[PDB]
Write a protein that binds this ligand. Structure first.
Ligand code: HEM
Ligand code: HEM
Ligand code: HEM
Ligand SMILES: [Fe+2]
Ligand SMILES: [Fe+2]
Ligand SMILES: [Fe+2]
Ligand SMILES: [Fe+2]
Ligand SMILES: [Fe+2]
Ligand SMILES: [Fe+2]
Ligand SMILES: [Fe+2]
Ligand SMILES: [Fe+2]
Ligand SMILES: [Fe+2]
Ligand SMILES: [Fe+2]
Ligand SMILES: [Fe+2]
Ligand SMILES: [Fe+2]
Ligand SMILES: [Fe+2]
Ligand SMILES: [Fe+2]
Ligand SMILES: [Fe+2]
Ligand SMILES: [Fe+2]
Ligand SMILES: [Fe+2]
Ligand SMILES: [Fe+2]
Ligand SMILES: [Fe+2]
Ligand SMILES: [Fe+2]
Ligand SMILES: [Fe+2]
Ligand SMILES: [Fe+2]
Ligand SMILES: [Fe+2]
Ligand SMILES: [Fe+2]
Ligand SMILES: [Fe+2]
Ligand SMILES: [Fe+2]
Ligand SMILES: [Fe+2]
Ligand SMILES: [Fe+2]
Ligand SMILES: [Fe+2]
Ligand SMILES: [Fe+2]
Ligand SMILES: [K+]
Lengths: 155, 155, 154, 155, 155, 154, 155
């Protein structure tokens, strides 16, 4: 039996994963639909990463005797072109990261160091997502948008 | 976009790494030159470890949007014989480790748990290095210097 | 070892030290920017100079000198790809100039084994210079954006 | 032995092979030098094709008890940028093809059907070179000079 | 950008390579045509050697920002029988080797050590060519002409 | 072939021939004492010099001179391992000095291929010198008995 | 402690091995230099065999507590053409064989049966050398000098 405020945080984090999963899945398919297959494939793997984050959160919530909340789906940020799509993912990650850090503070406070550890490993992974996303946005500026999309057409 | 003092702490640690890379590479080659090829190889391994520490710090700094400092090289503690060389390496590692604990404190205070994780990984490895060095100096007292060196002539 | 040979060899060593750190930082800068093929090529240049330094350090010790790894000259760090290449080029041209003077001096005291070491390093520095001048040249011919594009993925 | 006029024709064709060898090898090496390595390698291949054409003409001429002329080297057409280099190669090929068709007419007239066959193989291969070259000058127009060159940087 | 006088020397060494390629290639095929195929294969290999020296010289000239001269072809020294053919190659190598020594001296004088090194490699191979050729001429004296040729009929 | 270059090559060859016998005797002296690792290493030095000799012999003949395997100068034979190592070191320092002078002469008459050969030999002699000095330094640092002990078994 | 006179016999045999090693090495390289490579390969094998005999004599002498003499080198018999070379080698082997028989008597006389055995093996090998050398001299008479040298040009 875990602490109630930590379980609530785990659920908040899980809520954030549920959004990211659907948002990235849809963006991946949007990119695939437009023949930008490489963007589509990379986004798809981002989506699978969030699905695994979720899975670990769900196991942890149950082990601590909480109820995993898969019912509440927050606001998807869907873009209409590849540059908005990248910025929408990036805004979602920055929000996920704020929430991860407050959850980690809470775990530390009540000595739930195993939850803390799970949260730190997700955070490292969201920081990599941010890195990738900011880099793509930078590349579009350095190589020009048309060139960037050309380079992400074929796998 | 990370904290200014965290970046500065990472640059400090990076500075300690750069020192260790040069001191250890030089010690390693001095040992090879003397035909103490086992001590040379091991010291070469330590040098490569510190090169890999530097790499990871540089990448973290760049990602947090700081400027990695590879320009400032502190004082190399260069020994004149194997007992001095080991003790000089031990002195540098004890100093790197003190700096690493202070950097970790700050990362925790400002919620940069990914930087902290990197620093902890680096601290764990510096503590192995200290173990290696204290062990050697102890072996010199237990088996005698001439035996110690003889046992480290041939790889 | 002629004391002046050792001094030339420590001077080359000091150039190697600057190139190592300059190229390693430039490599990581390009990786950070997502230009991984430039990043990887530059990392490979950094490694070559680490190897030159190693051989310089072995030869100096053999001739009974003290390798200087304490003094680190000025890094030329660029802030965009063209400037980073030009910095790399400017460092190589300086390095190549010292190597030549060191080779003259080795010949004059008959340290022919030091001459051969340094001529091997020089050959590798001319290769580096060729790579650098070629990338500049290619930026002019294909355009900066296309050049960067073709160095994004490995 | 061979008809004297046929041997002269075979030598004129060899003469054209020797220009092309040298012109194509210099251009290959110019392209490599500029880091256009895909162009370089393809032009090197074209050079080698012509070395093999020379080799067969030399063998045939000696078999017909004629004297192969490798002393007279005509005018190399060297360009100073890639569009000029391709146009120079194409001008040379159109010249070579015209000489080939006239050597073949003459072989037919004097019943030297084996030399005709060798000449026809060479002609088929020059026709492939012409196609390669016209196609490249065409792609320059369709994809733009810069994009064309970009796509022939790396092998 | 290399030394004007160095580039002019490299072009003179190139001129010598271009003469040797054609001369040895013709000699090779004359020997093949006569059924002396071992002599023919060996001379072909010498030909290939020279082509490879040419390629090296061309790359270096282009790297020193010079203009390689494949336009001028000096005088082929062509023999009528195996003894004259070997002697003509030998005459040509000795001239080549004299030019090599002069160019090396010049590279040394202006500190182009990488060009000197290229030219020394070529020189070592030309001295191997001279050794080969002198040895054959000696063997023709020791074993008699007819025996020499008989031993070079089949590969 | 230039006559003074040929006489310089024959002089290098005379040094190689001394080195071969001295090193081979030293090797078998060490094997006979049961210091087999020293013996094996000395044997490998001996073979190196046999290969140096072979190479000089071919060059001398190509240049149309007469190789001299008739004159065999003074072997430096030690009586214990320190002294045997020091004799070899004194022979290498002599050899190296003659090498430098021959190389000077080859350069002055433009025999660059002979110079290349001599410079490869020299590089190898300087490696032999580094092995030798290094073993002598190791006797001082680990003790003569320890050093011998670590060179008993292969 | 070996018998002083056996050790002096052993050193005389070793003296002969050292002359043979140098004489055959040089004749081998003279054959290679002349392009007579099969003669040269075989002579080289002979020189190697004498190097092995010298090796075994050295070990024996040192085991018997004697001083091996590698300082004194007797007269090389060097020839100027292939017939002289072989006859020179033959004169050196007959001289070696006479000294070997005398050492074997001495060994037997003082009961050093292991030395006699080492020398017996050496003798059998010198007799094989003699067979090879007289056989080649015979062959020159039967097939002619020029045919003989022709058959020994290529390996
Ligand atoms: C005196 C300065 C240095 C010397 C002498 C030196 C020498 C070397 C050598 C010999 C190697 C292995 C080369 C090989 O693959 O054969 C190496 C590897 C490496 N170095 Fe350095 N180095 C120096 C400085 C640095 C610095 C400043 C960095 C900065 C991060 C660095 C990062 C690396 C990395 C990432 C590797 C590859 C390690 C691996 O094997 O995974 N080195 N260094
Ligand atoms: C008469 C003029 C020439 C003739 C007849 C000729 C003939 C040949 C032939 C038959 C080959 C082998 C082709 C194969 O792969 O089957 C060859 C290869 C080659 N040629 Fe030429 N060649 C000539 C001139 C040149 C010139 C002027 C160059 C200047 C660089 C050159 C450079 C080369 C090179 C680099 C190769 C590849 C050799 C190797 O790597 O094995 N050739 N040549
Ligand atoms: C005391 C005089 C010498 C002794 C005792 C000696 C002994 C030996 C031995 C034991 C070997 C290894 C043979 C085997 O079993 O394969 C060898 C190889 C060889 N020797 Fe000598 N040798 C002597 C002098 C010479 C001389 C004067 C030369 C002239 C160059 C020479 C040239 C060679 C060469 C080229 C090899 C083959 C090395 C290799 O590539 O492995 N040796 N010698
Ligand atoms: Fe996630
Ligand atoms: Fe909380
Ligand atoms: Fe994420
Ligand atoms: Fe990408
Ligand atoms: Fe497509
Ligand atoms: Fe470290
Ligand atoms: Fe702090
Ligand atoms: Fe450390
Ligand atoms: Fe370098
Ligand atoms: Fe100087
Ligand atoms: Fe460089
Ligand atoms: Fe053709
Ligand atoms: Fe006609
Ligand atoms: Fe063609
Ligand atoms: Fe193409
Ligand atoms: Fe590239
Ligand atoms: Fe050549
Ligand atoms: Fe000149
Ligand atoms: Fe040649
Ligand atoms: Fe036949
Ligand atoms: Fe030697
Ligand atoms: Fe001299
Ligand atoms: Fe040596
Ligand atoms: Fe050892
Ligand atoms: Fe034992
Ligand atoms: Fe023998
Ligand atoms: Fe007797
Ligand atoms: Fe024998
Ligand atoms: Fe035979
Ligand atoms: Fe042959
Ligand atoms: K493009």
């Amino acid at each position: 039996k875990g602490d109630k405020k930590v379980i609530q945080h785990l659920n908040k984090i899980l809520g954030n994963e549920l959004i990211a999963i659907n948002q990235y899945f849809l963006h991946s398919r949007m990119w695939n639909d437009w023949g930008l297959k490489r963007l589509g494939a990379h986004e798809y793997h981002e989506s699978i990463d969030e699905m695994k984050h979720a899975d670990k959160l769900i196991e942890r919530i149950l082990f601590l005797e909480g109820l995993p909340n898969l019912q509440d789906l927050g606001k998807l940020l869907i873009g209409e072109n590849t540059q908005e799509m990248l910025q929408c993912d990036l805004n979602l990650e920055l929000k996920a990261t704020k929430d991860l850090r407050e959850a980690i503070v809470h775990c530390e406070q009540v000595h739930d160091y195993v939850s803390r550890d799970l949260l730190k490993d997700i955070l490292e992974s969201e920081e990599e997502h941010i890195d990738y996303l900011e880099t793509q946005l930078g590349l579009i500026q350095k190589v020009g948008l048309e060139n960037y999309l050309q380079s992400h057409m074929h796998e």
